[PDB]
Amino acid sequence: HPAAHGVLRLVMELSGEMVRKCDPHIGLLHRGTEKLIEYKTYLQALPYFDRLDYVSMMCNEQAYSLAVEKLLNIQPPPRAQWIRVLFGEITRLLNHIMAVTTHALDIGAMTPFFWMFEEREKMFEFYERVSGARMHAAYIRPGGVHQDLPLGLLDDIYEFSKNFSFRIDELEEMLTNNRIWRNRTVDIGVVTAEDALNYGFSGVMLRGSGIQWDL
Amino acid sequence: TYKFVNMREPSMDMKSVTDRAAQTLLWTELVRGLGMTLSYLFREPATINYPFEKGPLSPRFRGEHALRRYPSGEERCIACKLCEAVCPAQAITIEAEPRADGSRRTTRYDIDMTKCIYCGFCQEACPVDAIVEGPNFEFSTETHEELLYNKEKLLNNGDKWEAEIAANIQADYLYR
Amino acid sequence: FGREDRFLNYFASMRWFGGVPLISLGKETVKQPVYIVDVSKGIINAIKDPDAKGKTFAFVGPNRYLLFDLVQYIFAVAYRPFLPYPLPHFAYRWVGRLFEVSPFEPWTTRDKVERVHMSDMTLPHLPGLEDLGIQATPLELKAIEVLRRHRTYRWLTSEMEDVKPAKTVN
Amino acid sequence: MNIMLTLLTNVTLASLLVLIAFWLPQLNAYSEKTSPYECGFDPMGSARLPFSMKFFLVAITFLLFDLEIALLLPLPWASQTNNLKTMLTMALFLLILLAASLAYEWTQKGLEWAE
Amino acid sequence: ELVQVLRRGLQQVSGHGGLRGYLRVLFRANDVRVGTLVGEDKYGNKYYEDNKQFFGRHRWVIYTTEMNGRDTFWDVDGSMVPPEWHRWLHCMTDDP
Amino acid sequence: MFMINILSLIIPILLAVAFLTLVERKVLGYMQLRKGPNVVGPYGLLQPIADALKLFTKEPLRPATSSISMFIIAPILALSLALTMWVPLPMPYPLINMNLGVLFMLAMSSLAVYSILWSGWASNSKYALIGALRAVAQTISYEVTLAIILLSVLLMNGSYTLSTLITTQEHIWMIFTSWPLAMMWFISTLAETNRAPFDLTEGESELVSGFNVEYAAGPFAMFFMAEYANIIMMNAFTAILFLGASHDPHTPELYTINFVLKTLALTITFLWIRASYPRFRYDQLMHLLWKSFLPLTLALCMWHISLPIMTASIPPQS
Amino acid sequence: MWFEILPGIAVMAACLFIPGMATAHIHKFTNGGKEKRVAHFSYQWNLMERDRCISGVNRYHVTKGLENID
Amino acid sequence: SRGEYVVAKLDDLVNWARRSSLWPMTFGLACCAVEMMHMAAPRYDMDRFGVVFRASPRQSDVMIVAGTLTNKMAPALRKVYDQMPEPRYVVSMGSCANGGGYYHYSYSVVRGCDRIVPVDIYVPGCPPTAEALLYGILQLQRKIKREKRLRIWYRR
Ligand SMILES: COC1=C(OC)C(=O)C(C/C=C(\C)CC/C=C(/C)CC/C=C(\C)CC/C=C(\C)CC/C=C(\C)CC/C=C(\C)CC/C=C(\C)CC/C=C(\C)CC/C=C(\C)CCC=C(C)C)=C(C)C1=O
Ligand SMILES: CCCCCCCCCCCCCCCCCC(=O)OC[C@H](COP(=O)([O-])OCC[N+](C)(C)C)OC(=O)CCCCCCCCCCCCCCCCC
Ligand SMILES: CCCCCCCCCCCCCCCCC[C@@H](O)O[C@H](CO[C@H](O)CCCCCCCCCCCCCCC)COP(=O)(O)OCC[N+](C)(C)C
Ligand SMILES: CCCCCCCC/C=C/CCCCCCCC(=O)OC[C@H](COP(=O)(O)OCCN)OC(=O)CCCCCCC/C=C/CCCCCCCC
Ligand SMILES: CCCCCCCCCCCCCCCCCC(=O)OC[C@H](COP(=O)(O)OCCN)OC(=O)CCCCCCCCCCCCCCCCC
Ligand SMILES: CN(C)C(=N)NC(=N)N
Ligand code: SF4
Ligand code: SF4
Ligand code: SF4
């Protein structure tokens, strides 16, 4: 299904078109990553985390590296830390572009998808320049980062960041004040703060519900 | 610190009320979206003319594998099995024995390119720069068996791509 | 007979041409069809048997049927209205000659008509599936695999046991 | 005559297109190919089961408003009469009664879909 | 001016060696651009560069009509380039 | 000669439909910063031909659970009515000159509704049934609003003859006269032709291709042809009804050129809207027409009944 | 560039020109080089039938005049 | 021969249509699907070549198996492949679809989609770049160009 992201089986009971219950059937992309990680070493298990949330790859790598370094009782050098934070924010930009554009595409709007995916292509070029892999970089590792930046990467990242707020503005021109988008999204999926905290939501769910929390 | 994404209230003066009513009756923001798409229509497309044009790559790119040689023609690999040990997916099968001249050389060196995850650990673990991940990425086949490379295939890839592989390694060997 | 066969599909595809033409109403034809999986298993076991090197086997089914009863059971399982009628042999031969002018795969031919009319021979001297180690599968157990495709929406979900087995001639 | 010929031509062309579509290509059908589509899994129920209609009242109101538009359609010819004042009063009366029907249903919540 | 654009189009038409060359480059490459000849390899492929175009489109190749023993007039692959021109085209270096 | 005229009306319409497919691809591509089809032919001109040949050489299948009779009839009815709607259009001379040429188009559109209903019900699948019911709701709303809007606009005209529409629009444009009704009519034609933001019967995001989910090969191509013919026909009707072109009886080619240009402009506006907006929900579409357009439509109908009387500008009956 | 869309729109316009021009040419051809008579009412139809009768050739578009009355 | 010439021209015409109009099914499983989106993106626009995504399997010619095929998912993949009408083609993209990939020795992963469906093209990589997938699509088109169904039938 185009809206089911490929590997979700949503068994739904409908009275007419009203949804009476949702029974998400997951596991269609269960691979046994944890068992395989048990069978690999610590360096061999890094690409597994690279492939878990394949839209925030360096973020997954950073989480795994932080855990392993905490267990090892070591500290990454300051330049490695700054590179980690920079690429974590670049990864956040990639992920949020993907999220917003795919959400708008399931709604019915596709031009923002194409524009922001051109931007995603440029950020993929940054990933490939540092790591040699366009997405699954395996660049952030326990102890720092694998290799140092090439001698033009910072200038090109500056150019990209310089010309990106205009892309976000063009994205907002099509969605923010559009009455069709407001009708489709306003008062849909309202979740209270107590419900979010009990159900275990984190990040944008909590912040949208109004809880002031950020790791 | 924090900021409120949506907590503004509209003014109730007559001019603002009339402006909102005009926006409701006359589809102002809808026309605005139309204008944005028209602007993008008149902009320049961002499409390359593949296959006559190629996207940029870097000396660090990890593509098809290759086994290199010394400038004298001798194979660099010494059957040390570090790449086989470090391979995350266990895609490398190596078997070795003393050669006729007594060298430590491989008799079997297989890489299952359907099992490889193209992570580049093997070229990091190699102490003699024998196995590398070349710049080639257009090597799709029509049968599964053709993706099960062996030593002859990898040596042929190395001999075919040696110039570009050497150039990439020269460019990027100071960062390693 | 099987999912992709001619036999059951040939008899079940005569819905389109009105009734079912039968020579002598199919009362003079006796047939014992064999299952495709049984035939393939017998071929495999012939390779693995060292004592079948230079031999001749006869693969036949467990039950013999008249052509009329067989076609009637086919249409019963397919849940189609069965309207048989006698067609003289020369008329059927001319009809088969008409259908074999197709450049593509013909629906029927004169030789196909003759083979359908001909009764299956009995060869008790030659070995068979029981000798190669295979128990022959009766038609009543695997007919619904082939003929469920020919049913309509009204009768798709009908079960295997809803149709009484055809009358055998043993 | 001309309109009948045109309708025959259109229907014949469409039927010829269907016939070519169903006979020109190579056919290979089996049970799995012709099974119903439900995103790769077998449907639990049947597509012939009742499908609740949450806008059942709006449909009936649509029937009545279709009658109203049928009444209103002969207005262009009625505007050529000498009794312009009576024609105008009756046309406005019909339109006001239609508006009153809409207002009554809207305030009594007949346009809200069943929950 | 539209006249300038039309004149540039006419120059592009005359830049491929007449109308026939323009048609050949249009039908087998879907591009009618004109660029400086960087060089040509032993297999017949030609390589052109134009720095005025935006990055990615600044270098291109016109493939040969016959490589080794296969007729490649219409069937043109991305693997028909030797490794050195492959590196040059994919921009791992700025030196041809 | 009448058969020749019928062929001259049919075949160019199908050709324009195929090249409308190509044009929509390319326009959406350039608005999405792409190029669209430019490889199959010169500027991708052979792409519709390739698509048509592929579709009609591909295998069409009837689902096991489908009702074959209404499974086949629905595309036939759709394409037949799509081709039939063109016969009373004056460009500048209609093929069939009808005294009541507008009510004919209304009736044929209301009949063209049932093709998607019967195809969805015949397919015997849940997505097809959901698409069919979405069609039911959409037709309800747009049908009532379309009827009243057309009534008012033709009330400014005097009769139900499209040639009389040309005569009325000899001097100025009905868009200048009655632009609010023009806006609401454009939205109603979007809803009628099932174009974005109202493409709810074939909404790919919620349903997998909607009502024609089970249709493949030729029968699918016929639904596509019918939809695009309806798009072009509705845009041509809008151009005739609101953007009147000058007519010269001795050289009628000028009216044909102007009519074609205005029709192409409106079709491009349709494609532009599809590229620019999200998709409605069908309950929100029903509440849009009844709660917003219908009150204004009734008020404007009263206004356009009264205006000729109070200004002594009643059009001639003939 | 955006003018690569023009050939497709040009072909679509060329296709849309054919119906109207063809209808006009056929109307003039089958009516003696004049417009096809519009008979929306019984009076106009009776006029056409009278023209057919007085023409002497069973064609309403064959117009007769003073040379025919005298 | 005249008949041979006619059948050669006819099946060149038919193969051209199928090559130039490819409609992949909207079917992506894992991280390899993001590179399909980037192939659809403006940089490597697949719509140029006549390659257009269709959601329904009834209206698709190519199935691009892009991602890990699990035991819980294999029946759905086979079902949609069967529901695709003929002629139909399969492009397995990435290591997970090709062989096992990173998850070859797993209890819950099918070791290759070629165990389930007949695969025509294998595109290596984890994930293959958008250019690599585009090269695979072009190789599939060149494979279609060699099909001679009418030429086989005439000599049949
Ligand atoms: C699985 O996860 C996912 C991916 O993967 C991992 C992805 O990648 C993506 C990324 C994809 C997207 C963002 C978009 C993909 C989704 C879509 C729904 C596709 C979007 C595409 C568009 C909106 C535009 C593309 C165009 C489309 C879809 C239209 C399709 C085209 C057709 C159906 C054309 C077929 C019809 C035709 C050809 C018309 C019929 C032909 C004729 C009428 C011609 C006939 C002419 C004659 C008979 C006349 C002949 C006679 C003549 C000439 C003269 C003879 C005269 C005589 C006298 C003899 C997403 C979102 C995703 O979620
Ligand atoms: C019902 C409609 C009647 C009016 C038709 C008006 C014209 C229709 C124009 C559109 C044609 C669409 C198909 C285009 C061609 C491609 C398909 C094709 O070749 O199909 C042919 C079909 C093909 O058969 P097929 O079923 O194998 O089709 C598969 C075709 N390929 C391989 C191309 C996919 O031919 C036949 O069915 C008959 C072949 C010869 C056998 C004759 C049997 C006898 C009955 C007919 C002959 C007359 C008997 C007279 C005496 C009767 C009394 C004894
Ligand atoms: C839609 C209404 C129905 C129409 C019915 C058919 C009407 C005629 C259809 C028009 C035929 C167009 C043929 C187009 C020729 C192909 C163009 C050319 O480029 O193809 C070359 C040659 O093509 C093939 O060799 C043969 C193609 C068809 C040749 C003629 C076939 C017979 C046509 C005449 C018969 C039509 C009427 C008979 C049927 C009714 C090979 O190039 P290709 O590799 O691909 O391109 C790759 C892209 N690159 C170059 C950028 C990499
Ligand atoms: C003929 C060519 C016309 C071309 C027009 C093209 C316009 C641009 C096309 C892009 C738009 C297409 C996609 C948009 C579809 C949806 C648009 C839409 O939503 O419009 C409805 C819009 C939104 O409503 P809501 O925000 O939901 O508020 C409801 C509160 N309960 O509401 C409307 O009804 C607007 C419709 C236009 C009304 C007309 C303006 C009325 C002004 C009257 C003044 C004239 C009075 C005449 C008397 C004169 C006295 C001297
Ligand atoms: C100037 C005078 C006129 C000159 C031109 C005359 C001919 C014009 C075209 C007429 C229509 C096609 C006529 C028949 C062509 C041959 C088809 C044929 O017999 O194909 C048989 C063969 C089936 O395969 P087979 O070898 O039997 O294997 C059995 C399966 N295991 O192979 C197949 O079935 C292959 C699958 C495709 C078959 C159908 C397509 C054939 C070509 C059609 C081209 C035109 C399409 C028009 C579509 C409608 C309009 C848009
Ligand atoms: C497969 N993935 C990750 C998707 N996001 N897919 C999608 N169709 N949107
Ligand atoms: S790139 Fe990684 S997965 Fe591939 S052979 Fe080398 S070590 Fe193994
Ligand atoms: S790491 Fe290098 S030298 Fe050691 S076995 Fe592998 S390729 Fe040979
Ligand atoms: S081959 Fe690699 S990128 Fe593709 S689905 Fe598997 S893990 Fe993801």
Report the CATH number at residue B130: 3.30.70.3270
Distance CA B95, CA B48 (A): 45
Whether ligand 7 lies within 6 angstroms of the CB of B117 is answered as yes
Looking at B21-167, which runs of residues are DSSP E strands?
65-67, 92-98, 104-112, 131-133, 148-149
Strand-strand pairing, C84-86 and C20-22: parallel
Helix (H) / strand (E) element for B14: namely helix B14-25
As beta bridge partners, residue E21 has none
Which residue's entry shows tokens 């009153």? D100
Q: What are phi and psi of B123, to 5 degrees?
A: -75, -20
Residue G66 CB partners (closer than 8 Å, separation 6+): none
Q: What are phi and psi of F101, to 5 degrees?
A: -85, -20
Note if the bond before F92 is cis, omega within 30 degrees: yes
Distance CA A4, CA A10 (A): 8
Resolution in units of Å: 3.0
CA-derived radius of gyration, chain A? 20
Atom of ligand 6 nearest to the CA of A7: 1
In one letter, which amino acid is A97? I
- Residue pair F89/F98 in contact by the 8 Å Cβ criterion: no
Contact H17 F34 (CB under 8 A): no
- Residue pair F146/F186 in contact by the 8 Å Cβ criterion: no
For the purposes of burial, counting CB atoms within 10 Å of the CB of A28, is it exposed (0-12), middle (13-18) or buried (19 or more)? Answer: buried
Domain that holds residue H83: 2-155
- Residue pair F285/F200 in contact by the 8 Å Cβ criterion: yes
As beta bridge partners, residue E48 has E37, E60
Handedness of CA A92, A93, A99, A103 (dihedral sign): positive
Q: What are phi and psi of H134, to 5 degrees?
A: -65, -40
Touch between chain A and chain C (3+ CB pairs, < 8 Å)? Answer: no
Q: How many domains does chain H have?
A: 1
Which residue's entry shows tokens 């060298």? B103
Distance CA F92, CA E43 (A): 60
List the one residue out of F180, F190, F202 whose CA is nearest residue F270.
F190
Distance CA D111, CA H95 (A): 55
Distance CA C35, CA F146 (A): 64
Angle between helices F101-123 and F68-84 (to 10 degrees): 160
Whether ligand 2 lies within 6 angstroms of the CB of C126 is answered as no
Residue H156 is assigned to a ligand binding site: yes
* Cβ atoms within 10 Å of F177's Cβ, excluding its own: 17
Looking at B10-161, which runs of residues are DSSP E strands?
65-67, 92-98, 104-112, 131-133, 148-149
* Cβ atoms within 10 Å of B150's Cβ, excluding its own: 12
Using DSSP's 3-state secondary structure scheme, residue A19 falls into strand
For the purposes of burial, counting CB atoms within 10 Å of the CB of E88, is it exposed (0-12), middle (13-18) or buried (19 or more)? Answer: buried
What tokens appear for H40 in the block? Answer: 């659809």
DSSP letter at A153 equals H
CATH number of the domain residue H42 falls in: 3.40.50.12280
* Cβ atoms within 10 Å of A194's Cβ, excluding its own: 10
Strand-strand pairing, B92-98 and B65-67: unpaired
- Ligand 9 geometric centre to CA of H68 (Å): 7
Residue of D nearest to C4 (CA): D30
Cross-chain CB nearest to D41 (options H58, H76, H82):
H76
Kindly write down the DSSP assignment for every residue of chain F, as one continuous string: -HHHHHHHHHHHHHHHHHHHHHHHHHHHHHHTT---S-SSSGGGTTHHHHHHHHHHHSPP---TTS-HHHHHHHHHHHHHHHHHTTTT--SSS-SS--SSHHHHHHHHHHHHHHHHHHHHHHHT-HHHHHHHHHHHHHHHHHHHHHHHHHHHHHHTTSSS-HHHHHHHTTSS-HHHHHHHHHHHHHHHHHHHHT-TT---TT-TTTSSSGGGTT--SHHHHHHHHHHHHHHHHHHHHHHHHHS-----SS-THHHHHHHHHHHHHHHHHHHHHHHH--PPPHHHHHHHIIIIIHHHHHHHHHHHHHHHHHTT-PPP--
Residue of B nearest to A146 (CA): B176
Residue F312 CB partners (closer than 8 Å, separation 6+): none
- Residue pair A24/A43 in contact by the 8 Å Cβ criterion: no
Nearest CA to ligand 1 atom 8: H37
Touch between chain D and chain F (3+ CB pairs, < 8 Å)? Answer: yes
Distance CA B147, CA E19 (A): 45
Residue of F nearest to H59 (CA): F216
Cross-chain CB nearest to B88 (options A47, A118, A132):
A47
Q: What are phi and psi of G10, to 5 degrees?
A: -65, -45
Experimentally, how was this structure solved? cryo-EM
Q: Which residues of D33-70 are buried (b: 16+ CB within 10 A; e: fewer)?
A: bbbbbbbbeeeeeebeeeeebbbebbeebbeebeebbe
Which residue's entry shows tokens 């599968």? C137
Strand-strand pairing, E70-71 and A144-145: unpaired
Residue H126 is assigned to a ligand binding site: yes
Looking at chain A, which runs of residues are DSSP E strands?
9-15, 18-25, 140-141, 144-145
List the one residue out of G1, B29, B37, A170 whose CA is nearest residue F28.
B37
Q: Write out chain F residues lying below 8 Å of H20, CB-based.
A: 39-40, 46-47, 50, 54
Chain B CB within 8 Å of residue F218 CB: no
- Residue pair H58/F215 in contact by the 8 Å Cβ criterion: yes
Break-preceding residues in chain A (C–N over 2.5 Å): none
List the one residue out of C16, C37, C20 whose CA is nearest residue C74.
C20
Q: Where are the domains of chain D?
A: 1-108
Using DSSP's 3-state secondary structure scheme, residue C49 falls into coil
What tokens appear for F49 in the block? Answer: 């031909």
Q: What are phi and psi of E57, to 5 degrees?
A: -100, 5
What tokens appear for G46 in the block? Answer: 């009776």
- Ligand 7 geometric centre to CA of H140 (Å): 27
- Residue pair H26/A2 in contact by the 8 Å Cβ criterion: yes
DSSP letter at B110 equals E
User: How far apart, in Å, are the Cα atoms of F66 and each of A84, D38, F209, H2?
Assistant: 58, 14, 17, 43
What tokens appear for A47 in the block? Answer: 């690409």
DSSP letter at B22 equals H
As beta bridge partners, residue B69 has B75
Measure B14 CA to nearest chain E CA, in Å: 47
Distance CA E12, CA E84 (A): 29
Helix (H) / strand (E) element for A128: namely helix A111-131
What tokens appear for F142 in the block? Answer: 């747009």
Tell me how far the alpha carbon of residue B74 is from its chain's centroid: 29
Whether ligand 2 lies within 6 angstroms of the CB of C16 is answered as no
Strand-strand pairing, C84-86 and H121-123: unpaired
Kindly write down the DSSP assignment for every residue of chain D, as one continuous string: -HHHHHHHHHHHHHHHHHHHHHHSS-----TTTTSPPSTTS--SS-TTS----TTHHHHHHHHHHHHHHHHHTTHHHHTTSS-HHHHHHHHHHHHHHHHHHHHHHHHTTTTSPP-
CATH domain D1-108 topology: Methane Monooxygenase Hydroxylase; Chain G, domain 1 (1.20.58)
Helix (H) / strand (E) element for C21: namely strand C20-22
Distance CA F245, CA F91 (A): 10
Measure F272 CA to nearest chain D CA, in Å: 30
Distance CA F126, CA F208 (A): 10
SS (H, E, C) chain H: CHHHHHHHHHHHHHHHHHHHCECEECCCCCCHHHHHHHHHCHHHCHHHHCECCECCHHHCCEEEEECCCECCCHHHHHHHHHHCCCCCEEEEEHHHHHCCHHHCCCCCECCCHHHCCCCCEEECCCCCCHHHHHHHHHHHHHHHHCCCHHHHHHCC
What tokens appear for B24 in the block? Answer: 């409701």
Whether ligand 8 lies within 6 angstroms of the CB of B113 is answered as no
Touch between chain D and chain H (3+ CB pairs, < 8 Å)? Answer: yes
Q: Which residues of E25-56 are buried (b: 16+ CB within 10 A; e: fewer)?
A: beebbbbebebeebeeeeeebebbbeeeeeeb
| Number of residues that this document lists for chain H | 156
Q: Give the residue, out of H68, H70, H122, with the most ligand 9 atoms within 8 A of its beta carbon, to mutate for a pocket test.
A: H68
Looking at C52-95, which runs of residues are DSSP E strands?
65-66, 84-86
What is the CB-side half-sphere exposure of residue E59 using CA atoms within 13 A? 18
Contact A109 F277 (CB under 8 A): yes
Ligand 5 pocket list (CB less than 6 A): C 104; D 20, 24-26; F 52-53, 56-57; H 10, 13-14, 149-150, 152-153, 156
Chain A CB within 8 Å of residue F130 CB: yes
CA-derived radius of gyration, chain C? 17
What is the CB-side half-sphere exposure of residue B52 using CA atoms within 13 A? 25
- Ligand 9 geometric centre to CA of C126 (Å): 57
DSSP letter at G31 equals T
DSSP letter at E61 equals E
Which chains pack against E, by 3+ Cβ pairs within 8 A? B, F, H
Diameter of chain H measured on Cα atoms: 58
Domain that holds residue B170: 64-175
CA-derived radius of gyration, chain F? 20
- Residue pair F28/F275 in contact by the 8 Å Cβ criterion: yes
DSSP letter at A98 equals H
- Residue pair H47/H37 in contact by the 8 Å Cβ criterion: no
Atom of ligand 8 nearest to the CA of B79: 5
Which ligand ends up closest to the CA of H35? 1
- Ligand 1 geometric centre to CA of F18 (Å): 9
Angle between helices F218-242 and D2-23 (to 10 degrees): 150
* Cβ atoms within 10 Å of A89's Cβ, excluding its own: 13
Q: How many CB pairs under 8 A join B and E?
A: 71
Q: What are phi and psi of H79, to 5 degrees?
A: -65, -45
- Ligand 4 geometric centre to CA of B26 (Å): 6
Atom of ligand 6 nearest to the CA of A54: 3
Ligand 6 pocket list (CB less than 6 A): A 2, 5-6, 102; H 28, 33
Give, rounded to a whole angstrom, the gap between the first and last alpha carbons of chain C.
20
Contact F38 E30 (CB under 8 A): yes
Distance CA F266, CA F258 (A): 12
What tokens appear for F197 in the block? Answer: 């933001």
What tokens appear for F132 in the block? Answer: 């069919």
Q: Which residues of F8-27 are buried (b: 16+ CB within 10 A; e: fewer)?
A: bbbebbbbbbbbbbbbbbbb
Residue H113 is assigned to a ligand binding site: no
- Residue pair B92/B84 in contact by the 8 Å Cβ criterion: yes
